[PDB]
Write a protein that binds this DNA or RNA. Structure first.
Length: 76
DNA sequence: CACTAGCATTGTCTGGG
DNA sequence: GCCCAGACAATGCTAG
C-alpha cells in the first residue's frame, strides 16, 4: 500500500465538501483564495455547527491509532 | 509525454532550546 | 513540560 498520511483535523474534514462547494460556485477562484474563504467561514461557524466535524476528526484520530499503531509523525 | 513545487487555510504534532 | 519554528494533513490549478 501507499505511505501513511496524517489524520484530518476538524477543519480539514469540513473543508473537503466546503471547498468543493465554493469551487463549483466560483469556478474562477484558485485554491489559495478558496482557502482564505474557507478559513473565514470555519471561524464563523458556531460551536454546534463545528461539533460534528470536531467529533469526526477525533474518531479519525482514534481510528488512526488502531489501523496504524506504530505510526509516528516525522516532519522534515 | 512525465514529473514537481507552490499556493493558502486550521489544528496537531515534532525536535531541540 | 512550555517555547519556537515549522511540517503536513485535502484540494487542484499553475507553471517550470
Amino acid at each position: 500500500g501507499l505511505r501513511i498520511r496524517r489524520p484530518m483535523n476538524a477543519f480539514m474534514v469540513w473543508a473537503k465538501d466546503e471547498r468543493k462547494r465554493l469551487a463549483q460556485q466560483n469556478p474562477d477562484l484558485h485554491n489559495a483564495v478558496l482557502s482564505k474563504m474557507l478559513g473565514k467561514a470555519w471561524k464563523e461557524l458556531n460551536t454546534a455547527e463545528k461539533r460534528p466535524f470536531v467529533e469526526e476528526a477525533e474518531r479519525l484520530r482514534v481510528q488512526h491509532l488502531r489501523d496504524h499503531p506504530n505510526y509516528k509523525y516525522r516532519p522534515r
